[model samples]
Target: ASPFRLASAGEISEVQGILRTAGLLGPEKRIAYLGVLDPARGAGSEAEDRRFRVFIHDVSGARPQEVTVSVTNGTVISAVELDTAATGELPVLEEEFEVVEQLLATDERWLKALAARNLDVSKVRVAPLSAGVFEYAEERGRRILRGLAFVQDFPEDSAWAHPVDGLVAYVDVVSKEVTRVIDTGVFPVPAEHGNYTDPELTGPLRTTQKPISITQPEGPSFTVTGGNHIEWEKWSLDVGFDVREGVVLHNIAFRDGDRLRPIINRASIAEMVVPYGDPSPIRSWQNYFDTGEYLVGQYANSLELGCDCLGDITYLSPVISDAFGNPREIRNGICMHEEDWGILAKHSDLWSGINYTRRNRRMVISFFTTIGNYDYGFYWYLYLDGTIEFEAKATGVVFTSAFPEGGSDNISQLAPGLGAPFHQHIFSARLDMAIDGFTNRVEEEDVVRQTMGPGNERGNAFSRKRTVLTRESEAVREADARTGRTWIISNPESKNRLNEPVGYKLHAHNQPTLLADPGSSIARRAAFATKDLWVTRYADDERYPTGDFVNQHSGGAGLPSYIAQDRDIDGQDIVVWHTFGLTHFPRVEDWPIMPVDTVGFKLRPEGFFDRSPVLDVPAN
Candidate 1:
């Protein structure tokens, strides 16, 4: 079994039972939740043993307590209470959802707003929100939860497309009361055209196929070993799930000839932010750190066969806790499948009477997360040529604001009174490179057009500029399409047969960086999105690009602080940080729902392999 496997339902109940028998659970103490406590390799006595980290909160007004329990043979081996609290707090759970529903159902202020707007209390959509875009106050000891109020037309398909303009209900989970109501005053009626659930609303554009089928003649080409471990062809990786980052892949290795080589220690989405460009008080100063503000895994919609994925696919269920400290599963929260990747390589030699073509295939692991009206799908693909690519697909209704008189010159009109403001979707990935080994170097290669020397007066000449980044100070780089800049992570000692450094080149997708001024609050909060790449020495505690605590944060904690130390990264264990974003200028066609927009980065083998990695495969 994979060490990172989440605690099963039986293990969860056993941990709680152990705590209860030990007099740790009662009116004075209660179970907060539990998660997998993964032990380091060779740290445990046996490989199959499992452990769980449980949280016991003091109901009588003390800090929460943590306990680690081990399970052997379906029984608790031992339980040890820890001295410190569990690493920070987790995202709000199911109880918070119930609190929001009850508060909205009974509150006069909330009911009055719904009744005056001709919205039904039963039909109104209320979602518990993280404490985002708010000032932090230590008024209560318990965690505070907020809810964003949305309206759906009675007897409608779903409440996703219909949003009540700028209405938020703040509540205290401990007190279970609607503490305050925030209304942006400019109330825009739920866009009638935004409802996409109706068939007639979609016009004549419909799909009609005779139930196409995707199957493997010989079962499946891939095998999922040890539950959370995936091995297919030459690729092997350990799968993990985080409450904030959704799917995580670790210890990615690719088989080379007879041996396997390490590529990355961990690959995950570090941070994501959607910042609106409108300067209006209602719309401006509005930015959302999607992964930090809300737990992406918690909001992930379940996947279904033949719909979200096809072929003989493998699904993974992530275990999480509800508000009442009950363990539940997000069924089919992730999918793994293989797809045809077109042609990998082709060659033709007419004179020599030689022609060859090779078909390419790739294994894909994907999942989707919903944040309000926006739905994001994160996909990781492993190609036959030993290339790994990460893609972020954005689709869903546009998060819009109200304009009394349609759209202005700067804004695009989605509906009659709705203005889809300009925004930027920025995503950053944490790439812990173990390329060949832990000690690696980063070289910035720039393909630049050069003026020829006197020997050759012709100006049609280009040159590759290779610059070795020696320190963290010189490691930050940007995407330059004109120069064709690329970053290579390689080990100086490891070399291919041709004496070339074995490495992987990180190719960046050209997109606009954060346009907000450096002094602006948006820029400060999302400082990691300002650059295309940052190379830092690996620190165990530093995982997030924007620090660990992101809610209501005012910058100076994450990448900025890490790079400020100016630590040397050359020939040492290093991590690479890359940011990709799009400067989206909203258009009318994106009104009801925006078409899926894709942006990503790719890691291709530079000189890691002597030749095409898939050369031995049969031709198609």
Candidate 2:
């Protein structure tokens, strides 16, 4: 059985029936989660072919009771209570929006504002607001929903073209009532040129008529094993999903001669933060941790062909639990494909009058998730030369605010009355390395200019200084272009023919740390953004850099607390957290739809192979 195959709809019904028969299902008791349970390495066949774990939550009593059900066949093998925290599943997507729309229609204040602007209630758009700092929900011991309001200039046009200035509403999910209102009283008129209706008069636009296509005459150079596991040349990995993280890659390994060497055990995006730079009451608390607060996995949009991705693609669906603990399958949740990567390597011998060249190829796995107005495309590229690249591209409508006829000098006016504020989009990735095996060490390489000494009298050269981190206390590093600093994770016991330890180097491109003051709320909640890189001893519960619960979190449970132990890290299983982002000062061109802004990192092989592994590839 393929591990990629989730529980069928029939199977879900069967599990519900079994739970009802076992007195575990009720009005308040439901299946919080139901998914496939991966088997041990060599476990297969019909008798042990597939197994499932069901998470049942009973909220009838004073405290919630969490039950785990192990099932094989159609019967439940075992059911026991576990000491786990209550799961806070998000409300149904369309249902929550419907509720928000209904509430806004009856709101007199919102109705009056729309009347003053000559906009109808039907033309107003409402989007769910993520509750950061989770203070309200924690205080009530229940979950709540919030929303932001925007207006449309025309019925058929997008609401983002005209933003309703400084209006936010909070609703109680259980009662479905608009409980609170935050209006900044800044009633600025909508921008005239914000609408995307004009083409010729909007200025000269770039158009491409030349056709570009990628062809594989011999078909793809990769294979899918058991459906979910992909093997391309020297690379192999298993794809999976998490309710919060989404698109998780695990068991990543590479072919090294006759042996399959481990590269990373698992890799996933831990968190995403977009903090606005306005000091107004409405925008002051606009730091959004999309993954933790709103849950990116739940908001993932189904990918489309040609538009979202090109070339032949394999799409995978994900089963996520709804607010009432019902499993719903999201179509095209992940996309996988192969594409041309330009040239891999080239060389020419002038004396022999011969040139050798090899074209590059790569396998790309991607998924897209939207948080309010902005869409982020996440991609993982596996290259033939034993390199893995993680890229994030942001291309969506910019979150706009209303400004007067003459906007602030500090901000860029995308339109007549629309001001695009400066902000930062910070993303953190958690890489659990298992190079060769589980035990690995991290070394920092720093390049420095040479001084006049006995060995170098001319002082015209530079040298690299290597420092092997002996403890977790000293694993934090930052990228310096002047010094060319890089961090490498290696297996000390494994070596190549040249006596160098097998390793992979982490390379980041122009990532800026958080500029927020240390005492500020944005800095406190998003402390992980304070540094670009951090290495800590592996811990099962330590996955997110900004802590497990980021919504309304006050900054203490994440990487800082994990690394506070400062345990010995040498030759131990380790996890690396790398943060990459941009300090975006929005430009006028970023109005209706922002151009794709990409930020990424790469894990390149260093001293892992004796020679270039792709040298034997036939020229294309």
- Top candidate (lDDT): 1
**What TM-scores do the predictions have?**
0.87, 0.88
**lDDT (tens digit, per residue) of candidate 2 on 485-507:** 88889999999999988999998
Residues 1-620 of candidate 1: C-alpha lDDT, one tens digit per residue: 56666556666666656666666666666555455544543444656667665566553455656566665544444444432212344334444567787777889988877776777888777766555433445422345566666666666555545556666667776566677776666476656656665677877765775677888887767888777888887998988876677888888999998888999988999899998787755455567778876667778889999888888888988877543345678899999989888888888998998898888899999999988678999999999899999999998877765654744654566666666778999999999898987879899999977778775588777779888888888888888987888999998888999998899999998799898888787788788888999999988657788876565554667888898878888888899999997778877787677898999999999999988788788865
State the weakest 10-residue window (summed lDDT) of model 1. Answer: 82-91
Q: After superposition, how far is residue 24 of candidate 1 from its true place, in Å?
A: 6.8
| Candidate 1 clash figure, as a count | 2
lDDT, candidate 2, at 481: 65
RMSD of each: 3.9, 3.8
Give the poorly placed runs of model 1, Cα more than 4 Å off: 1-7, 10-90, 104-123, 131-148, 157-162, 166-169, 182-193, 204-211, 283-285, 323-326, 409-411
Whose TM-score is greatest here? 2
